[PDB]
């Protein structure tokens, strides 16, 4: 309306996961905060601990308001994601870098109308290696999934061929595309 802060296309929610051993996986999802302007985004990001400092078994998740960072959500069950793989040795030099860029593609609606298909993103820190992915609503939407992946790989700056794949959440639970 009057631009004292710059509005975002969507309100986003940042989630935290702690690899607990006495609750259902779904019960351990913990919400950090929600925001809907660019300035509020930066105040949260700048304050909370960076991804590279997450203890193994924990995650960060950024999803559109109302979509829980889990497969069962109605917006994720038929979807899937583009996955970026990182060995543990890249944690202090690449993880945060790739995470922030991922976050900027989301709040900035970087995939044109195809950003509507985006649900959120997740970064996983594991002793065996780390992961960063963007979740889309329909692994059946070829044109949207494809476009999302092209731009994303370009935004990350990944070499001509690191080759990143897209798998449906269903498979992961029990590549449909590459770029």
């Amino acid at each position: 309306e009057h631009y004292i802060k710059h509005p975002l296309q969507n309100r986003w929610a940042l989630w935290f996961f702690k690899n607990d051993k006495s609750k259902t996986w779904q019960a351990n999802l913990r919400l950090i905060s929600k925001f809907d302007t660019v300035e509020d985004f930066w105040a949260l990001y700048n304050h909370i601990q960076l991804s590279s400092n997450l203890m193994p078994g924990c995650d960060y998740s950024l999803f559109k308001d109302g979509i829980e960072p889990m497969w069962e959500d109605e917006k994720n069950k038929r979807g899937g994601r583009w996955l970026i793989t990182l060995n543990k040795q890249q944690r202090r030099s690449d993880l945060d870098r790739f995470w922030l860029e991922t976050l900027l593609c989301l709040i900035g609606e970087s995939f044109d109308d195809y950003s509507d298909d985006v649900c959120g993103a997740v970064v996983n820190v594991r002793a065996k290696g780390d992961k960063i992915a963007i979740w889309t609503t329909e692994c059946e939407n070829r044109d949207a999934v494809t476009h999302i992946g092209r731009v994303y790989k370009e935004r990350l700056g990944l070499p001509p061929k690191i080759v990143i794949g897209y798998q449906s959440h269903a498979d992961t639970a029990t590549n449909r595309f590459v770029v």
């Binding site: 710059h6 975002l8 296309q9 660019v38 700048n46 900027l104 709040i107 900035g108 609606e109 109308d113």
Partner: peptide
């Protein structure tokens, strides 16, 4: 639709 540039988003931290 509200779209923002990589550069503009970076400028908004100030």
């Amino acid at each position: 639709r509200i779209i923002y540039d990589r550069k503009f988003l970076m400028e908004c931290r100030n």
